[PDB]
Amino acid sequence: SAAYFLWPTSNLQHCAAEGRANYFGNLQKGLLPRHPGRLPKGQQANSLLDLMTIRAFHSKILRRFSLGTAVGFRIRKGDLTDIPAILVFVARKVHKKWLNPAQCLPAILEGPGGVWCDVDVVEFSYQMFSELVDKLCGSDECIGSGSQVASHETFGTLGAIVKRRTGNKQVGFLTNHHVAVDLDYPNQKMFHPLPPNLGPGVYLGAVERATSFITDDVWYGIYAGTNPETFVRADGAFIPFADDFDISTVTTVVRGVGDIGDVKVIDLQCPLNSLIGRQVCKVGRSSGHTTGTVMAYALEYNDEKGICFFTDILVVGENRQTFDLEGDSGSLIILTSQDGEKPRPIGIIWGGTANRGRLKLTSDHGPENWTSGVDLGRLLDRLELDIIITNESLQDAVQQQ
């Protein structure tokens, strides 16, 4: 019956940011530990939460000389270590001899409660033809992860087959919301592989929900920065399958990977090494199957207009090959099987913007491309979705809608 759009209404009147100023202020007044002295080994950062609270506390001394920050492990000579650090992204990485003490970043940083960590400096900036790509783009006899989805004006990738947690518990799929956005045209109807104005295809369904920006305090549960206009890039859209659409054609398998497990949630208190440095893979309609490494979490970026933006996952492709191309947006970021458990998804690729970023890891090599991913655990929670991972579970879920 409703003919209008409803905004996400996460305003939480300014107390959710009034508490932000008061949070960092009241921690600021309590400096008992005493003078510049090193810090004990027992209080070393261990979790993602630790690194994020340390970085947020010193955001403003870090922001001044930096393009951004992220949490992870220290990178020395291009190789990841297992040392909890805050990665500071500089425009150009120069020798210490050319820095004044105000500019030179420290080697250690102690946050609230004496929790300390390392500070790593990284130099920073901002089609595949295969049998797999053709299958994803409409040559296969099935629709699944990686399949090209399209509205009248935009193309995207189908991330996962999902079901809604609330109400009807409708079965559908998850993709990236910019492929479904209506300002010039109506882009509510999704099709595979092409929209009717461009060529043949099948009507998948109409967009129901979409998140674009969610404040950090809601997304992470903590204040990740001092800026009161802080948003998380939380791109995701839920499209319930059309009442006519033939569910027999959908597959819960990620083609080129196999049977995947349930979503692996990024718990901010687990030890870092379970996410940072882990090998991930992607199947998308543009680059097909690629392999990469998780370099960092919680990428801070304060932009021209004065708003802080966080990007959850930072992946760099293996062997100096780009992890993704433009158009892979929506693709599932799957943790590769280590000794034989089913590969579990941790995120989806965020829509590549114009002039995507790059970081230099070694002098011998040039700058490599990095890919930005959205936390799948948090996205499914915010969109109120459950991922369907077996073909039998799919037909069971359809029965109850």
Enumerate residues 267-306 that contact ligand ATP by CB under 6 A.
none
Closest CA to 140 of 229, 10, 251: 251
- Output the smallest distance, CB 193 to ligand ATP, in A: 10
33 vs 78 by CB, closer to Mg ion = 78
- Output the smallest distance, CB 203 to a second copy, in A: 7
Residue from the set 71, 86, 121, 204 that interacts with ligand ATP by CB under 6 A: 121
- Output the smallest distance, CB 335 to a second copy, in A: 25
- Burial class, 36, CB count within 10 angstroms (exposed 0-12 / middle 13-18 / buried 19+): exposed
Measured between alpha carbons, how far is residue 238 from residues 37, 125, 390 in Å? 52, 32, 19
262 vs 384 by CB, closer to a second copy = 384
Residue from the set 70, 71, 75, 388 that interacts with ligand ATP by CB under 6 A: 75
Instruction: State the Rg of the chain over Cα.
Output: 22
Structure tokens at 198: 């461009």
Task: Please give the single-letter amino acid code of residue 257.
Answer: V
Residue from the set 56, 75, 149, 385 that interacts with Mg ion by CB under 5 A: 75
- Output the smallest distance, CB 231 to a second copy, in A: 5
- Output the smallest distance, CB 127 to ligand ATP, in A: 19
Residue from the set 110, 118, 120, 368 that interacts with Mg ion by CB under 5 A: 120
Q: Which does 41 bind (CB under 5 to 8 A by kind): Mg ion, ligand ATP, a second copy, none?
A: none
Measured between alpha carbons, how far is residue 285 from residues 289, 354, 375 in Å? 9, 18, 20
- Interface of this chain with ligand ATP, residues 76 to 115, rule: CB under 6 A: 76-77, 90, 93-96, 99, 103-105, 107
Measured between alpha carbons, how far is residue 48 from residues 124, 268, 271, 333 in Å? 22, 5, 7, 19
46 vs 326 by CB, closer to a second copy = 326
Question: Which helix (H) or strand (E) covers residue 300, if one does?
Answer: strand 288-302
Q: Are 250 and 389 in contact (CB under 8 A)?
A: no
- Output the smallest distance, CB 155 to ligand ATP, in A: 17
Helix boundaries (H) for 65-172: 131-134
Options 21-29, 70-78, 293-301, 315-323: segment touching ligand ATP (CB under 6 A): 70-78
